[PDB]
Design a protein around this ligand. Structure first.
Ligand code: CU
Length: 127
């Protein structure tokens, strides 16, 4: 088991405002990801229909440094509720992205649509 960290930040290294860093975690089945409240006012919650079938969901409170389990392989699309409209979403890819087509079709409100397009390009082609 590997244990990864995703920081919830107001300002990222690459200039993003309201951002999870890294935006895309590449994990294996059984690994964990812990969210870090480096800046306050953020949360982490799984987006509706943004996980592979039968996967455990999560809905972290504001400033809650929640650790999520990643048993089933696939792409997990999650968001910050306060800043999702500003584009604050992230991805956790577990094993092979089998449900990549399905997660492309979910609801991405506001600037998270452009953020999702950047995330999907990063997973598929690297950049
Ligand atoms: Cu936020």
């Amino acid at each position: 088991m590997e244990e990864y960290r995703v920081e919830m930040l107001n300002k990222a290294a690459d200039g993003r405002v309201m951002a999870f860093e890294p935006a895309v975690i590449r994990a294996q089945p059984g690994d964990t990801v812990t969210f870090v409240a480096k800046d306050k006012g953020h949360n982490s919650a799984l987006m509706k229909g943004g996980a592979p079938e039968g996967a455990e969901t999560w809905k972290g409170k504001i400033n809650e440094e929640i650790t999520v389990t990643l048993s089933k392989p696939g792409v997990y699309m999650y968001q910050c509720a306060p800043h999702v409209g500003m584009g604050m979403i992230g991805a956790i890819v577990v094993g092979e992205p089998a449900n990549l087509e399905a997660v492309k079709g979910i609801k991405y409100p506001g600037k998270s649509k452009a953020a999702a397009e950047k995330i999907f390009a990063e997973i598929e082609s690297g950049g």
